[PDB]
Symmetry: C7
Subunit: 70 residues, 7 copies
């Protein structure tokens, strides 16, 4: 259970392009890396550009995912 | 599935190359992320650029999908 | 997607404000599609009539139903 | 199950994503993959002939679309 | 590849001379890997420490083992 | 019993493998292949603008980068 | 591809005109390869020695055996 380990945890989704990162609670996923983020907050350069709701992010745009410091 | 949850909801599909977002009622979908929108309205930088009928969007172009709130 | 066959549609190419309009003869899950009486549209101006075309998904952004 | 099959032995135009290049020829064979064989191939750039290539085998990816060339 | 599990490796992305270093926790044929105590390196300068990161193959150029 | 190599005929023939980017062509003998368009070229000569840029031995090419393959001469 | 295992090969990337030279330890049917004693060559010049590297298929242009 590689990716499932992060469910119900607060993570940072970083994209390949720009320095953009979505931070939120990782609702659901799938091997495909397609993921579901709740209470997602958009971060640019480490600055908040708002809160998006529940977003479904597609794998292809993802560089990597991290667990947000408790 | 993953996106079956949003069916019949008003959602925003955000593309990966421009500040464009298509808004509408997600009629149907599939794992491949390929979605059909109803009452689609194109949004550029947050500005309506008019209305397309029923559109079918190809996953590949999709950055993420959120649920529209009002 | 089959809900549009023999309907007048527009196939929007991702890369440049180019959209092919015609009737959607046939398709398949793959988003590869066959268009009839294709008309290529640049920034919404016609650039002539292509015959029947068989287009490749990958180049497609979206497909919409052309009116009335 | 074959897709385009209906153009085999037809005079068609294979247009590429980048460069207004068009490879015109007859189609030997094609498979669901859109990878296709072309006979008596003539490269076209902007509507101009830039020569003739033998028989070519094209890779789907670089293909925007295919059309039937007017009899 | 599983030869590197519990190994200090370095992940080099395709774009931009950015390498992620840390211990290779787990992986799979898909090249999608987990990295523990990752440290972002840019042009071979530490840009910080990411906690545990899960990387997507497609961004990866190559992986190497960090020297003893 | 259902699928086979659609490029079978060119094996051991003098071909030209053209890439998507540049105007680089790799000419050689088509050693082997596979539906995947992944091919083994023997006596591979790098061509740029129809100009030789030396010779590469046996090369193993990847389909992705390949625009099209053609048959070189009699 | 297996015909190169334990051979000295040079791997060519699509983007920089820079090649990875080394012993081809392993490879699977995905074009991903493990290279031992990798040396990185830029426009024909050596820019250093990487240890063991596992290279991802997508980045590769082509593979050749070496006149050593």
């Amino acid at each position: 259970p590689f990716l499932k380990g992060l469910v119900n945890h607060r993570v940072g989704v970083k994209l390949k392009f720009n320095s953009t990162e979505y931070r939120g609670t990782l609702v659901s996923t799938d091997n495909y890396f397609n993921l579901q983020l709740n209470e997602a907050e958009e971060f640019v350069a480490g600055v908040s550009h708002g809160t998006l709701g529940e977003i479904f992010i597609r794998s292809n745009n993802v560089l990597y995912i991290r667990e947000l410091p408790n």
